[PDB]
Amino acid sequence: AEPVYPDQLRLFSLGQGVCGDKYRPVNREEAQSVKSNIVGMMGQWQISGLANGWVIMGPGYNGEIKPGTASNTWCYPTNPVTGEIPTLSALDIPDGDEVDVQWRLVHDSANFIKPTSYLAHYLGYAWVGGNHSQYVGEDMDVTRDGDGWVIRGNNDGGCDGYRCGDKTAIKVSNFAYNLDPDSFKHGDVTQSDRQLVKTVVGWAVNDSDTPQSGYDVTLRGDTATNWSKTNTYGLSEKVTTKNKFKWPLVGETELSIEIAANQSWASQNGGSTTTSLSQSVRPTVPARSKIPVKIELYKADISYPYEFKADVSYDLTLSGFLRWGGNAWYTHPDNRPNWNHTFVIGPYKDKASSIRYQWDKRYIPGEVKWWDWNWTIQQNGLSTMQNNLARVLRPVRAGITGDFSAESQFAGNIEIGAPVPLAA
Amino acid sequence: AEPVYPDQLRLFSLGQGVCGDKYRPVNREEAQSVKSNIVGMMGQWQISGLANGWVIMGPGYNGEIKPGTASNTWCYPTNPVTGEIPTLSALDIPDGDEVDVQWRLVHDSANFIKPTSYLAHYLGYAWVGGNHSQYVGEDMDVTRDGDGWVIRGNNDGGCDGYRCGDKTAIKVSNFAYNLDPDSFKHGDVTQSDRQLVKTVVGWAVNDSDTPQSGYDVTLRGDTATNWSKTNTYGLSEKVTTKNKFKWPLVGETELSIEIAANQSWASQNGGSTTTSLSQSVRPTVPARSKIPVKIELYKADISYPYEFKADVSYDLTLSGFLRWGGNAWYTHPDNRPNWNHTFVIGPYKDKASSIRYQWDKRYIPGEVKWWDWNWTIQQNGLSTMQNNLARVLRPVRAGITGDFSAESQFAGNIEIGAPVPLAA
């Protein structure tokens, strides 16, 4: 009923359905689901015990599952562990030009070069390392090629081994920069002093013999409030947001500012919104007198530095010849073929370029069309591959900074002046 | 980890990783990043010491970096200095016709001719100077050619040297004029006297036996306020602003005036906006009497001279033959080829025509596709090139003046007249 991950299966040679601690016999359906793996994990004429009086036979028997019994039995953890790839803390790159950010990314040995090199090594790529070292991911030269980057083992000096000198190459390209609204941060908030926006004056004249309250001067209508933004390092020209979001509330003044999706961050450097504030003055004027009235509207400015984080995605191409001894390609070629494969480090786009999709669906033999990650787990272990892929898929975020300003706080002043006799 | 600028590296011949004051040994990764420069800065079979027990070998060894040790060692400042091109104070040209502004720009020897001449000289152009002087950028003739300008060393009289008479030419063209809203300035502000815009009168008649307050006369609706602008010298026909901006607040009266981007400044010489002011009169009329009521609306005019600054950008083409001894083109040709290259003095447009981009990315050998600025630094020094490029890239701003007027201040008057008996 539940999915079965082949890496957790193990054969106990103890007797009829014995298994070990926290290990239970495997049933017929789970067997059939992972028959390819299980039969590849046993001898040609070997016969092993399943649950419910069933047995699975070796490749010589064509992997038949038949009712029977045997002295050994395949077993599965009663408390299986999830093999999901851990998500690590994001790697933060300081804001800068696009090329500078890429340069800082690809020259980080611990976080980029070594993880990708070890991934290529695990997948079966040959000569992932330079001649001046015997360890994977060492003595690697980084070069700028076109709009992308190439990391390749140094080939200077001599080398020993078959086709040594055909070093594996790791190519980075197709950089894209999203934007995370939730990553917003701001510096010191500066609020300017009240500034007089406009003023309207008037006179209320009463030449009658009784006081009059029948006056009304009203100032209303939409008042446009403008907001402005600046960009610092020029990477913003490539930054986009997949979903429209509102500018975050800073202080206690909400600005109805919308950032459009699928548009350059550097193109949206200003705008205006509407606020409706109305004021009115209705004086009571004594007989034979005039009263002056005034309505004033003031604005104020709020400004602060801003910093967002742009998620960085790219395309990682591994190019080189797969090792004869063992590689992770599902056909397991043994002719040392030249091979190129592109992964998309970032959001899912397709199954072939998605490490996470292939890793998660490794319990479905029919979905294994590119890489056999179960083979990698068997060769190197579950934890090792988990950590390596977590480092490879570690989120990378580039700073996006600037300055922001907006006319937000609005104030009013309504004045009824002293009466003046009409004799004037 | 951090970028390494080759101009700051220096070889100490002292012993095993000695270096000098505030100078540390260079590691393997930084070496590999700037290997081309470092290996070009050493002898064919020379061997120099890196950090962590590594050594870098000369061109004869093909620039190999291998674990080892040597009696000398490359070293890098522990407190590196930024080689960024300084930004100087803007050069202000008085407002005038386009041709006059260009004429004043290109005839400024100290600010335009000599800097560009020295830039061409540093890049390796030959004969940047006239025959009547032995110094660069002297005895240079300026001529109007089509819609652009040409500065070339005077070729009158005799000359000594190979291909003397093939003087280098500096061509200016492609002038563009932006506009900086923040550069706004205004002269003396003139406010006119209140002028009666409109008047509505009425009668409130009460033929009953009790006082009546049930009257209301209301004057409201949008009131169009017009603004006008004049242009003085005719350069405004070419002036445009990349971003829409609001007319600055002058005095304490905000005018909702928007200047459209990508449109001629001289085409936007007026407009109108809407302000909503409403007045009402609700008299209390005594029995058997009539009262006259009046509502008046007045406007006023605010006018002042205005001055903005238009940032001037242009295309600077250097044409001439590169010196055999040494030039800054990345291929370092030695056949004295005729060569033409255009820089864009102003906003970035492309890598090839951007001095700032090439200068900043000089630590990436793969981005060095046009000019080798590290070669210029080695030949002439960092400070010299910094100052020369700052003068070349010095911002230039042309005046844009005129007169501005707008109907801004609005006033009202509400009058309730004296009662008149109905016997009349």
Numbering used by the authors:
A (entry chain A), B (entry chain G): 1 to 424
Sentences from the study reporting this entry:
Aerolysin is a β-pore-forming toxin produced by most Aeromonas bacteria, which has attracted large attention in the field of nanopore sensing due to its narrow and charged pore lumen. Pore-forming toxins (PFTs) are important virulence factors of many pathogenic bacteria, which are secreted in a soluble form and upon host membrane binding, they oligomerize into transmembrane pores undergoing a complex structural reorganization. Domains 3 and 4 form the 120 Å long 14-stranded β-barrel, with each protomer contributing two antiparallel β-strands. Four distinct constriction rings, two at each end of the pore, were identified from the structures and confirmed by MD simulation.
Here, we present the first high-resolution cryo-EM maps and atomic models of WT aerolysin in a membrane-like environment and its Y221G prepore-like mutant. Upon prepore assembly, domains 1 and 2 of adjacent protomers interact through a series of salt bridges and H-bonds that greatly stabilize the cap region. Furthermore, the formation of the concentric β-barrel fold contributes to the stabilization of the prepore through the addition of over 10 H-bonds per subunit. Interestingly, five H-bonds consolidate the lumen of the concentric β-barrel being present both in the prepore and pore configuration. The prepore stability is further enhanced by the hydrophobic residues at the interface of the two β-barrels. Pore formation retains the tight network of bonds between protomers observed in the prepore, while introducing several additional interactions at the folded hinge regions. Overall, previously unseen interactions between side chain and backbone atoms can be observed in both prepore and pore conformations of aerolysin structures at high resolution.
